[PDB]
Amino acid sequence: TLSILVAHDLQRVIGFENQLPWHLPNDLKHVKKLSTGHTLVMGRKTFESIGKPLPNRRNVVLTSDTSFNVEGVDVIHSIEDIYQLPGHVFIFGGQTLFEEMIDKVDDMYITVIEGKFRGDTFFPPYTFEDWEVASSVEGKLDEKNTIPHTFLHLIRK
Ligand SMILES: NC(=O)C1=CN([C@H]2O[C@H](COP(=O)(O)OP(=O)(O)OC[C@H]3O[C@@H](n4cnc5c(N)ncnc54)[C@H](OP(=O)(O)O)[C@@H]3O)[C@@H](O)[C@H]2O)C=CC1
Numbered sequence: 001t002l003s004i005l006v007a008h009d010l011q012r013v014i015g016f017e018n019q020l021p022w023h024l025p026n027d028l029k030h031v032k033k034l035s036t037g038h039t040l041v042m043g044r045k046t047f048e049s050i051g052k053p054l055p056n057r058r059n060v061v062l063t064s065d066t067s068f069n070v071e072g073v074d075v076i077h078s079i080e081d082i083y084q085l086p087g088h089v090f091i092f093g094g095q096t097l098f099e100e101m102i103d104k105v106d107d108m109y110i111t112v113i114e115g116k117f118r119g120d121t122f123f124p125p126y127t128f129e130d131w132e133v134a135s136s137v138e139g140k141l142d143e144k145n146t147i148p149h150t151f152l153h154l155i156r157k
């Protein structure tokens, strides 16, 4: 199973100066629920921005640096190596990798942040003509989750 796992805002911003533009604890738990026990693939810049691999799942980093090695991180150097990964595999970031992968994945788990942030990293444009809406669930606003957001699970037609 090959999926995209992304959060972007109303203009597809997914990042600004190595950071998430928004603090949204509910989306983290959403990420933890979907990806625990499975595989996360990410480009080198996405990984360095987190700074440590995420617990209780396989962390795979794509890079051309043959010296790259991090404890708890499996390295690949080829787009093609992604397809040799066993199990449910999530493309986690960033813009470059999504651009390479958005035409290959079976489905996408998008968190739409109903806001307009300043960004420098973008999720690629996509149209609903090509994706069926398997589910659309609004996140709940509260104390710590203060921006409207929506979980989409889109499947390719
Ligand atoms: N929401 C998110 O996913 C967030 C992501 N980011 C980031 O993404 C931003 C923009 O950078 P972006 O380039 O999209 O990040 P990526 O995570 O996609 O990293 C790109 C890197 O991945 C490696 N790579 C990609 N494709 C291949 C390939 N086909 N073969 C071998 N290696 C490959 C290269 O690593 P190498 O150069 O080592 O060879 C390349 O430089 C960064 O500023 C960073 O902060 C920032 C905040 C949030």
Ligand SMILES: CCc1nc(N)nc(N)c1C#C[C@H](C)c1cc(OC)cc(-c2ccncc2)c1
Binding pocket: 005, 006, 007, 018, 019, 020, 027, 028, 030, 031, 046, 049, 050, 054, 091, 092, 093, 109, 110, 111
């Ligand atoms: C959740 C945000 C998020 N949500 C969804 N639904 N998909 C995603 N792919 C990401 C994402 C992301 C990037 C990799 C990111 C950047 C970052 O910059 C500091 C910190 C984290 C992060 C710190 C702590 N735990 C998990 C992830 C993740």
